[PDB]
Amino acid sequence: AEFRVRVSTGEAFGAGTWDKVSVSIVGTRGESPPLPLDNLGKEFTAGAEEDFQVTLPEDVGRVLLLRVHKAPPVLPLLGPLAPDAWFCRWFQLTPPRGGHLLFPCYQWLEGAGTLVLQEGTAKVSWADHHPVLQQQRQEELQARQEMYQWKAYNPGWPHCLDEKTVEDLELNIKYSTAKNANFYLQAGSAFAEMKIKGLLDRKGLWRSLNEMKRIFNFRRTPAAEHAFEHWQEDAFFASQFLNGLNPVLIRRCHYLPKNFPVTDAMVASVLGPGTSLQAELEKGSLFLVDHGILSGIQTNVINGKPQFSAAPMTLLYQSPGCGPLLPLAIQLSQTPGPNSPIFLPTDDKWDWLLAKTWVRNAEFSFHEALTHLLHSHLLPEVFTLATLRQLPHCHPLFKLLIPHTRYTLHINTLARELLIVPGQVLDRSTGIGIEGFSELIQRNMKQLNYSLLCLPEDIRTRGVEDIPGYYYRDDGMQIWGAVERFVSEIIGIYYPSDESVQDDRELQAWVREIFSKGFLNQESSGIPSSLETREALVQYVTMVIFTCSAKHAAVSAGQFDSCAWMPNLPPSMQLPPPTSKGLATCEGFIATLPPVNATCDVILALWLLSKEPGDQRPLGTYPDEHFTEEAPRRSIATFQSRLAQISRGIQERNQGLVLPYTYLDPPLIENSVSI
């Protein structure tokens, strides 16, 4: 008839509560009356953990549900008070001479109401058929689906959350007040610096290449100074296709596209007389970076001046024996001919540099619209929203995935509110603008596939499993492995058979919703619409976790490093590509690069998005203990120590590198997409 009730309250700002709190214990034999927890004093302040003794009049049998009621204090003749939001971490029941029942919560009880919690043992739908529990899950998902709905944002995009402003979001999916203030103080300080130098207000060109170094009095990193030092070197231009901002396009080439008419003469130069184009295509030493998806893209206006975008192709040569990757030829158009010369490293200094810079402009547009926004933000939001809608709090797959959604709905809502709207940085300072970004996302959504999101298949598909110096691959594959091993352990704990995967109705609705709302029911994407085997579930969940953590970390962390020296990543171009050779100059080169205000507005935004503001939850670190069972908790431990070992490999590796690759070091990977 006695229970001890132990309650943990959150540490965040505002976590604690004035309000009175009572719990009803529901069991197989019946439900108890509400039981007070107010005890003596302000028991529910931030960071508190405190015990209460409740006596149950009637026995309840096996405990099934904990109902938590919250209500503001009540004054005689004056009514209640304003509700005081409470962040509850978890409850622990301890019956007479029995073990502990632990009820993970980790949510906000804003205002007055009641919250129903199952014990912490993860339960697939078929795992406990008690009707009281089936009702609770069913009611929870109905409530979630009303809370968190879909809207169509643009034609041909993935659908997104049906909310207009960050103000309208539930506490449970909002930035913490600490992370939010850290964010606005950074952005505020940075905008102030950049504005008071008049650089956000200079229309017109940079005065010289020297003047563009002024960006280093704004912000400095060693990676970014390296780009100033080495930007003109062919080996650094090429190395950034493997370890820079956008390391996902390079692919081995046995057959040159017919629209890229490279000749033997054009490459005898770099290749030596001991070989031939056809001989190197066959040897597997030639690689292609194809920016064709940009062809004919709508372009923007900046300070009333039309801007330009190319859609180029770059041939690259892997020299033997850990030698450098080297560019061989660049065509800046998808349609060859006399007005789209094929530029070579042997051309005049500024012809070749101008050609390389247009490719670097193309990486800017490709990376930010597709690799960053669509693949690392929109797809994680779909995964997140589907999870909220289809997987209930007690489901092992919710327990597993929820840390990897943190703040994702918040940050995408913010982008839709303040980033991709008129007057903001996209519209005022990029070459392709809002419309070009949407065009790119619409095109990509029509040829996107599962293999690009699964890193081992992506590496295999692109024929880049052996190319040396590819640290995005080296480190990403180790991480992929660690996540895959973690997910496979967790699946094996709770799903005994392929039949049990199919029989999971909630799991099947979750995949289906992702396929429909996120991938627009396109069977050409190859993304599963159902999951029939344990093996396929493991692969699919690994893809979600990897995409939400390491994938976004890999393509977000080098943004500022890559763009601080603007010729290394011009966000726009102001003259069309050259239509013949022998015309490029330094003066002409700076005249093609973007105006000062657009340069700085973009760097300011890339600096703020490169860095996690506020506090970090690095990959594998799970302070909200949704898993309360020994087995998953061992699996977490194994995942954490494997990441730490990968991190030691990365520092040892990086020790003897002039340009270390840090974007996939696990401590610096966030669990979710949050910036």
Query: Annotated binding residues, as ranges?
Result: 14, 16, 38-39, 41, 43, 84-85, 372, 377, 552, 675
The C-alpha atoms of residue 6 and residue 544 are separated, in whole angstroms, by: 35
Give me the least distance between CB of 393 and ligand C8E, in Å please.
27
Q: Which of Fe ion, Ca ion, ligand C8E, none sits in contact with 286, Cβ below 5 to 8 A by type? A: none
Considering the rule CB under 6 A, would residue 421 count as an interface residue with ligand C8E?
no
Considering the rule CB under 6 A, would residue 548 count as an interface residue with ligand C8E?
no
Category of 535 on φ-ψ map: left (φ > 0), alpha (ψ -120 to 50) or beta: alpha
> According to CB under 6 A, which one of 1, 81, 152, 192 is a site residue for ligand C8E?
192
> According to CB under 6 A, which one of 89, 252, 372, 399 is a site residue for ligand C8E?
372
Give me the least distance between CB of 16 and Ca ion, in Å please.
6
Give whole-number Cα distances, 611 to 182, 215, 553, 623, in Å. 11, 17, 10, 22
Cβ(8)–Cβ(66) under 8 Å? no
Considering the rule CB under 6 A, would residue 464 count as an interface residue with ligand C8E?
no
Considering the rule CB under 6 A, would residue 15 count as an interface residue with ligand C8E?
no
The C-alpha atoms of residue 147 and residue 458 are separated, in whole angstroms, by: 36
Give me the least distance between CB of 376 and ligand C8E, in Å please.
8
CB-nearer residue toward ligand C8E: 136 or 413: 413
Residue numbers 170-189 binding ligand C8E by CB under 6 A: 185, 187-189
Give whole-number Cα distances, 555 to 52, 292, 422, 617, 651, in Å. 49, 20, 25, 18, 20
Closest-CA residue to 140 (of 390, 385, 383): 390
Q: Which of Ca ion, ligand C8E, Fe ion, none sits in contact with 556, Cβ below 5 to 8 A by type? A: Fe ion
Residue numbers 4-43 binding Ca ion by CB under 5 A: 14, 38, 43
CB-nearer residue toward Fe ion: 125 or 556: 556
CB-nearer residue toward Ca ion: 41 or 96: 41
Q: Which stretch binds Fe ion (CB under 5 A): 76-84, 554-562, 616-624, 649-657?
A: 554-562
Cβ neighbours of 339 (radius 10 Å): 12
Judged by DSSP in three states, 386 sits in helix
Judged by DSSP in three states, 71 sits in strand
The C-alpha atoms of residue 230 and residue 317 are separated, in whole angstroms, by: 19
> Which residues neighbour 505 within 8 Å (Cβ) at sequence distance 6 or greater?
125
Give me the least distance between CB of 108 and Ca ion, in Å please.
9
Instruction: Supply 439's token pair.
Output: 């065009």
CB-nearer residue toward Ca ion: 37 or 379: 37
Buried b / exposed e over 461-485, threshold 16 CB at 10 Å, is ebbbeebebbbbbbbbbbbbebbbb
> Which residues neighbour 118 within 8 Å (Cβ) at sequence distance 6 or greater?
64, 65, 66, 103, 133, 136, 393, 394
CB-nearer residue toward Ca ion: 14 or 660: 14
Q: Which stretch binds Fe ion (CB under 5 A): 45-53, 191-199, 238-246, 552-560?
A: 552-560
CB-nearer residue toward Fe ion: 173 or 344: 173
Residues in the chain: 675
Q: Which of Fe ion, Ca ion, ligand C8E, none sits in contact with 11, Cβ below 5 to 8 A by type? A: none
CB-nearer residue toward Fe ion: 537 or 675: 675
As annotated, the binding site for Ca(2+) includes: 14, 16, 38-39, 41, 43, 84-85
Cβ(611)–Cβ(175) under 8 Å? no
The C-alpha atoms of residue 405 and residue 409 are separated, in whole angstroms, by: 8
Closest-CA residue to 477 (of 488, 466, 491): 466
Give me the least distance between CB of 382 and Ca ion, in Å please.
32
Full DSSP string of 516-553: IIITTT-GGG---SS--SHHHHHHHHHHHHHIIIIIHH
Closest-CA residue to 17 (of 107, 109, 105, 89): 109
The C-alpha atoms of residue 266 and residue 263 are separated, in whole angstroms, by: 5
CB-nearer residue toward ligand C8E: 356 or 372: 372
Give the count of residues interacting with Fe ion (CB under 5 A).
Answer: 1
Considering the rule CB under 6 A, would residue 279 count as an interface residue with ligand C8E?
no
Give whole-number Cα distances, 185 to 12, 417, 553, 561, in Å. 19, 19, 22, 21
Residue span 72-111 as binding mask against Ca ion, x where in contact by CB under 5 A, dash where not: ------------xx--------------------------
Considering the rule CB under 5 A, would residue 556 count as an interface residue with Fe ion?
yes
The C-alpha atoms of residue 20 and residue 44 are separated, in whole angstroms, by: 9
Give me the least distance between CB of 152 and Ca ion, in Å please.
36
Residue span 595-634 as binding mask against ligand C8E, x where in contact by CB under 6 A, dash where not: -------x-xx--xx-------------------------
Q: Which of Fe ion, Ca ion, ligand C8E, none sits in contact with 418, Cβ below 5 to 8 A by type? A: ligand C8E
**Which residues would be at the binding site for Fe ion (CB under 5 A)?**
556
**Which residues would be at the binding site for ligand C8E (CB under 6 A)?**
185, 187-189, 192-193, 368, 372-373, 377, 411, 414-415, 418-419, 425-426, 430, 602, 604-605, 608-609
**Which residues would be at the binding site for Ca ion (CB under 5 A)?**
14, 38, 43, 84-85
